[PDB]
Amino acid sequence: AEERLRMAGQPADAAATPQPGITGRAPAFVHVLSFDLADTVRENTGTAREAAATVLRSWAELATRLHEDGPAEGTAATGLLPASLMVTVGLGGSLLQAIGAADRRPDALADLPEFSTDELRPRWCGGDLLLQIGAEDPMVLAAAADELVAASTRTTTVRWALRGFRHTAAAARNPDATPRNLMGQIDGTANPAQDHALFDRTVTAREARDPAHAWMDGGSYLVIRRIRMLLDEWRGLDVPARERVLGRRLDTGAPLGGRKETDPVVLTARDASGRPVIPEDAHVRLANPESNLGARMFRRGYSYDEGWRDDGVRDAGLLFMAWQGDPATGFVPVQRSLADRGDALNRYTRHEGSALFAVPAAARGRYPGQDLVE
Amino acid sequence: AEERLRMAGQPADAAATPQPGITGRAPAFVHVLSFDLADTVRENTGTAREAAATVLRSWAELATRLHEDGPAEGTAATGLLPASLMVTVGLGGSLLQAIGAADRRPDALADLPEFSTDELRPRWCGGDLLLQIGAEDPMVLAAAADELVAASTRTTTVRWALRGFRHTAAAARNPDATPRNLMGQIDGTANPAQDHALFDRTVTAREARDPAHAWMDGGSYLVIRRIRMLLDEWRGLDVPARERVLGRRLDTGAPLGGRKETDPVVLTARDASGRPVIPEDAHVRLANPESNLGARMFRRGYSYDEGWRDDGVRDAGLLFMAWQGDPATGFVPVQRSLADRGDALNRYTRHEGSALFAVPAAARGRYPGQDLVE
Numbered sequence: 152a153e154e155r156l157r158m159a160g161q162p163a164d165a166a167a168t169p170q171p172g173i174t175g176r177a178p179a180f181v182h183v184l185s186f187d188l189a190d191t192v193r194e195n196t197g198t199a200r201e202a203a204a205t206v207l208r209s210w211a212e213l214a215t216r217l218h219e220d221g222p223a224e225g226t227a228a229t230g231l232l233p234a235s236l237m238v239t240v241g242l243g244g245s246l247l248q249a250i251g252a253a254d255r256r257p258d259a260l261a262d263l264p265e266f267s268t269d270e271l272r273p274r275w276c277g278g279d280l281l282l283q284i285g286a287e288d289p290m291v292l293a294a295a296a297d298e299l300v301a302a303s304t305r306t307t308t309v310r311w312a313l314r315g316f317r318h319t320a321a322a323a324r325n326p327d328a329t330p331r332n333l334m335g336q337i338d339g340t341a342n343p344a345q346d347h348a349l350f351d352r353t354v355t356a357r358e359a360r361d362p363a364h365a366w367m368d369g370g371s372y373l374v375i376r377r378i379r380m381l382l383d384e385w386r387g388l389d390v391p392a393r394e395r396v397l398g399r400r401l402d403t404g405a406p407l408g409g410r411k412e413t414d415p416v417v418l419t420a421r422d423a424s425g426r427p428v429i430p431e432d433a434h435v436r437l438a439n440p441e442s443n444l445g446a447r448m449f450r451r452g453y454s455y456d457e458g459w460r461d462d463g464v465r466d467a468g469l470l471f472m473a474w475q476g477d478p479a480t481g482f483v484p485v486q487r488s489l490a491d492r493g494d495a496l497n498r499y500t501r502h503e504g505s506a507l508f509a510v511p512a513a514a515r516g517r518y519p520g521q522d523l524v525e
Numbered sequence: 526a527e528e529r530l531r532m533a534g535q536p537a538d539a540a541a542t543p544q545p546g547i548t549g550r551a552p553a554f555v556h557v558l559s560f561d562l563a564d565t566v567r568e569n570t571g572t573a574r575e576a577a578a579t580v581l582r583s584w585a586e587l588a589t590r591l592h593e594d595g596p597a598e599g600t601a602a603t604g605l606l607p608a609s610l611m612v613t614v615g616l617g618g619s620l621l622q623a624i625g626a627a628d629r630r631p632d633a634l635a636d637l638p639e640f641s642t643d644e645l646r647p648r649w650c651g652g653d654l655l656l657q658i659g660a661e662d663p664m665v666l667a668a669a670a671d672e673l674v675a676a677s678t679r680t681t682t683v684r685w686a687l688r689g690f691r692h693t694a695a696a697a698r699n700p701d702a703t704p705r706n707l708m709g710q711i712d713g714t715a716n717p718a719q720d721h722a723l724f725d726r727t728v729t730a731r732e733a734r735d736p737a738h739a740w741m742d743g744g745s746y747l748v749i750r751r752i753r754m755l756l757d758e759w760r761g762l763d764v765p766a767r768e769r770v771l772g773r774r775l776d777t778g779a780p781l782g783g784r785k786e787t788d789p790v791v792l793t794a795r796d797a798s799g800r801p802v803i804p805e806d807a808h809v810r811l812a813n814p815e816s817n818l819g820a821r822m823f824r825r826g827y828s829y830d831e832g833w834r835d836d837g838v839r840d841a842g843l844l845f846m847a848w849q850g851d852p853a854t855g856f857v858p859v860q861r862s863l864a865d866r867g868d869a870l871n872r873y874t875r876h877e878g879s880a881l882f883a884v885p886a887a888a889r890g891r892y893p894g895q896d897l898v899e
């Protein structure tokens with residue numbers, strides 16, 4: 152009962168680094184918003200930089216109030232508990248271009264490459280600025296998102312936005328169990344544990360050798376992918392076929408040759424026929440760090456459901472979010488493996504949006520990106 | 526703590542009448558889906574009737590399993606508590622036309638009139654068939670909706686669908702408190718209490734005098750309105766101005782001349798100037814049964830958030846749902862008062878979708894609409 156109620160009844164840890172929204176338990180709901188600087192503030196790099204400073208300071212001041220007290224009285228969230236409300240601010244490479252700070256762009260903020268399976272909509276890609284807003288309650292989330300967007304109106308425009316969800320802690324039979332996605336799969340098993348030195352090695356940017364790039368010291372890079380799931384096709388597969396696509400069992404989450412969710416995926420194991428226990432094209436084989444020269448990431452994603460598009464196909468799937476110190480040793484080589492080496496999951500998924508954001512560490516009395524912008 | 530956990534941890538009352546989804550505590554989430562019979566089943570009224578019988582029986586059988594056991598293993602909801610999952614089935618007047626049952630249409634199923642403030646999109650209006658799916662958890666809801674839509678694929682097509690939300694019970698400081706909407710207003714105060722004879726008088730269809738219409742005995746009629754809120758304009762009003770628009774206080778929900786949420790709205794009360802305490806154009810004045818020759822309804826609505834449309838304006842608002850025994854003595858005269866007599870709330874709202882559905886009573890070993898269709 153205590154763990155069923157904790158997420159909805161407690162505030163987030165506002166001191167979590169680099170910013171709230173990476174460590175700790177992930178709340179049940181997310182709103183991911185990508186913003187562009189308004190066309191009216193782009194006369195020159197100076198007017199763009201002043202706009203960026205205005206909105207980043209405004210968001211930081213409001214985030215501090217939201218973390219400490221919640222959405223104000225007179226909002227949709229009046230009368231509700233803090234529900235683990237957390238606000239994360241991210242900066243796109245395009246922001247640095249727009250404000251005349253190209254020489255401050257770290258190598259890790261390089262644009263993501265195209266991949267062979269991309270079906271990306273340009274209006275769902277990129278963005279100068281990111282807000283990731285999380286909460287255990289949708290009304291707390293809605294009230295915070297409304298306030299934060301209102302603070303941005305004169306300097307920015309919403310480029311794209313997506314709401315996502317997981318199960319709520321209150322509805323979990325076992326509150327410590329790994330969540331499932333819309334394909335019914337246990338989702339998150341192989342993430343590095345947060346109390347582990349592997350977590351910081353995976354998530355935190357490498358200390359800059361160029362002081363122009365040191366504004367990202369202690370920060371992390373977020374890759375977002377909007378991945379539609381082909382759920383009608385997936386529904387046609389029986390359970391053994393679904394498990395062959397993934398490499399893990401649907402009921403237990405165990406690797407196909409194991410017995411428990413936490414048993415290791417043994418990529419060298421062979422069955423009685425001499426063929427691999429984990430199929431050659433199984434998702435967990437091709438995504439494994441062992442298949443990618445050690446590339447690793449922290450996946451903290453959400454499901455989304457946008458209803459039905461005009462052609463009648465369901466638009467629902469995975470709001471994929473991966474955290475790493477450098478996309479070149481995380482998302483990028485792994486996604487190249489999935490795209491080029493024939494991940495069986497490619498038959499049931501479509502990457503339709505994409506963005507990369509730099510998420511700097513919080514600093515006392517300073518707003519995210521201040522030492523970049525000012 | 527017990528009331529914070531009850532909605533997420535308990536099944537719905539599957540024996541609630543006319544069907545689940547009207548009485549009891551309303552779950553935090555809803556998915557409203559409107560379906561049309563597929564164009565391929567409309568050769569004649571006989572092929573349409575056979576399609577209707579197929580999908581209604583399929584939905585009823587699946588609803589029985591969902592109410593008793595929840596979404597199956599191998600779905601997104603595996604490992605979750607029942608979360609008050611409830612499924613309601615409704616029938617549109619257009620269904621009765623399509624299956625050759627025009628003489629079975631009760632007078633109360635007459636099409637809603639146009640109102641002077643309508644801004645309705647035709648693709649967001651009407652429908653042959655309704656599913657209202659509710660749950661306290663979004664993954665339980667998503668899994669049930671997926672199964673129910675899958676059961677409908679060969680006979681129907683989704684016409685429109687909208688997901689809605691309230692606060693979760695787990696996040697309520699006071700779990701018995703009335704919910705708020707996206708304008709921050711306390712929403713639901715004047716509803717008839719469920720343990721009250723007024724509730725059944727308000728919600729339940731009047732016993733038919735024509736046996737051809739008796740299939741709706743014990744049922745209710747649902748009016749759905751998709752009402753966009755002009756939240757950016759609303760944000761410009763100070764609190765006294767917001768309260769003047771509504772007629773009730775933002776902090777307490779009391780009528781302007783009262784002290785407590787439950788104090789009566791005294792429409793005859795005058796201030797020291799001789800003017801009404803409750804303004805002449807306040808929403809709660811024009812919506813009051815006293816202003817409408819006793820017309821009354823049971824409002825069981827949800828908030829929605831569909832992001833931003835192509836013109837950049839936020840598409841969020843109220844998924845209005847009103848239950849009554851006859852729209853002519855419920856929704857219709859009240860909406861005519863709001864539209865024609867200048868409700869101040871008209872300045873901040875836009876009705877963009879609309880539907881009327883007949884929701885018949887459940888019967889032992891029979892599916893909703895069986896005695897109409899067979």
Ligand code: HEM
Nearest residue numbers: 336337338339340341378435438439440469482485486500
């Ligand atoms: C909708 C698309 C996807 C689905 C449904 C999906 C699902 C899953 C599932 C169920 C697992 C096993 C449990 C776990 O360890 O988390 C897994 C593992 C993993 N996935 Fe995905 N995934 C998707 C896309 C991606 C993408 C785009 C990437 C990276 C580019 C990725 C990287 C990984 C990694 C690194 C692992 C852990 C492998 C290991 O070390 O054992 N996934 N995925």
Ligand code: HEM
Nearest residue numbers: 710711712713714715752809812813814843856859860874
């Ligand atoms: C987005 C649009 C609307 C909003 C924000 C809104 C909000 C409210 C609020 C805050 C109350 C007071 C608390 C309560 O008694 O529930 C109220 C009362 C009421 N509303 Fe609305 N409403 C909207 C649209 C409508 C519509 C379309 C109808 C019917 C056609 C309606 C019918 C009523 C009724 C009957 C009452 C109770 C009046 C009484 O007996 O005191 N409302 N509404």
